[PDB]
Amino acid sequence: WGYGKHNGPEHWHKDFPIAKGERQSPVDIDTHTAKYDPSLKPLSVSYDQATSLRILNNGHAFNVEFDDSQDKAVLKGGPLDGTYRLIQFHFHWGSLDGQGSEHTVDKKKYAAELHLVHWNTKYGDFGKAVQQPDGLAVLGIFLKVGSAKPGLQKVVDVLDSIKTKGKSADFTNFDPRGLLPESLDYWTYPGSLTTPPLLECVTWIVLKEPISVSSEQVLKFRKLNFNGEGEPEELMVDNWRPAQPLKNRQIKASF
Ligand SMILES: [Zn+2]
């Protein structure tokens, strides 16, 4: 699978029939239809002990991986019951600044979207957690092109070293607090992984406030390659799934 005309999102259902399921992601967030939910408990992003390990080009994005062998960086509160551990983050982005996000807001596409992936510790490991409807919590943060994000530049500066599929580099001591906007106001809905295997195991938490990154920062994302070393060059751009039917779901606002 991939994002090309021959292997992209419109093909995924043949190998992953859940692609046409009842709780697929991403979705369009209609700001007028989302309802404030006063019952949402406060959201808790506890990243002060986060331990990053490595950055990897997996052929569809780059992932920054964390040590999740104890409760260091965790997400709690909001719509969540219990404790979700940070395991990785990655982005989705466009070939052009007018596209790249997976979620949309009143059909507005952002230049990119950050996904901070967490798993429910009650299931003991990530592989078990993805088999549960409440297994994962993904924090989604929109990127718009404007002012540079200083907390992103350490990621930007290592991308030259992982240009092609299967390349990795040590990425210790990275603080994911520097990727957050000021406000933690969010929307939330039940959904899925946005890449195969498209498992319906995600509580999505999408922040309303985007972060600003510079044109030069997102230009460097678009210099990555989908391909392996020594294969024909395919720029890693437009690695986003389009919005999926909402079906029988309600998007809740924290604000
Ligand atoms: Zn993602």
Side-chain angles (χ1 to χ4, degrees):
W1 66 268
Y3 291 97
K5 156 165 187 233
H6 299 289
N7 61 358
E10 296 316 301
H11 290 269
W12 298 345
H13 71 99
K14 291 177 277 173
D15 277 318
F16 303 99
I18 203 170
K20 293 191 195 286
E22 298 300 306
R23 60 172 278 185
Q24 292 287 295
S25 293
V27 302
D28 180 56
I29 301 161
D30 179 334
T31 66
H32 295 291
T33 299
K35 190 185 169 62
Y36 172 68
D37 189 346
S39 79
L40 283 168
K41 307 277 192 286
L43 194 64
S44 178
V45 189
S46 303
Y47 289 172
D48 45 287
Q49 294 292 126
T51 300
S52 64
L53 292 177
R54 194 175 71 140
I55 192 171
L56 170 66
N57 180 335
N58 60 23
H60 48 100
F62 61 87
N63 288 2
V64 172
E65 299 167 347
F66 290 81
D67 181 353
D68 64 333
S69 69
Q70 307 188 256
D71 270 351
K72 280 171 307 315
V74 298
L75 183 68
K76 303 177 164 157
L80 302 175
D81 290 340
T83 297
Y84 289 69
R85 288 197 193 156
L86 178 67
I87 181 157
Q88 52 113 325
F89 70 76
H90 63 271
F91 305 79
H92 309 264
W93 60 93
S95 53
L96 308 151
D97 299 345
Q99 64 202 69
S101 64
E102 295 210 303
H103 294 91
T104 59
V105 181
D106 300 327
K107 301 294 177 83
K108 177 188 174 70
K109 294 173 164 85
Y110 287 90
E113 190 176 328
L114 169 59
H115 289 163
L116 294 134
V117 180
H118 315 76
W119 62 270
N120 197 329
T121 58
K122 81 189 218 149
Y123 300 122
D125 66 61
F126 185 81
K128 289 291 217 162
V130 299
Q131 304 186 51
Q132 315 305 320
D134 59 349
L136 291 200
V138 183
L139 184 60
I141 305 179
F142 298 119
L143 281 61
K144 66 180 176 89
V145 172
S147 72
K149 194 64 167 176
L152 181 61
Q153 189 65 29
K154 276 176 57 181
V155 170
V156 167
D157 283 337
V158 79
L159 296 180
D160 269 351
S161 77
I162 61 154
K163 179 181 173 84
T164 52
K165 181 172 183 173
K167 296 295 182 188
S168 73
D170 304 303
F171 205 65
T172 55
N173 302 112
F174 179 74
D175 188 350
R177 291 183 292 186
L179 296 178
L180 306 179
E182 290 178 357
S183 180
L184 294 181
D185 290 345
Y186 61 88
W187 299 280
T188 182
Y189 76 93
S192 73
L193 304 184
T194 74
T195 51
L198 302 172
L199 294 170
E200 292 182 336
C201 62
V202 183
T203 301
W204 275 97
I205 302 165
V206 178
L207 294 194
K208 172 168 49 58
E209 187 174 1
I211 59 162
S212 290
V213 303
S214 68
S215 60
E216 294 82 6
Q217 286 181 320
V218 67
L219 280 159
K220 289 189 191 182
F221 282 24
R222 297 180 185 130
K223 292 171 83 218
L224 292 164
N225 291 179
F226 285 128
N227 58 281
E229 187 183 6
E231 298 171 358
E233 180 170 26
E234 305 167 79
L235 294 175
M236 186 178 282
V237 295
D238 294 319
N239 54 358
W240 49 277
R241 191 192 192 185
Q244 302 300 310
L246 192 56
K247 300 291 221 337
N248 197 38
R249 295 176 289 180
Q250 286 201 324
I251 305 183
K252 296 301 200 190
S254 75
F255 59 91

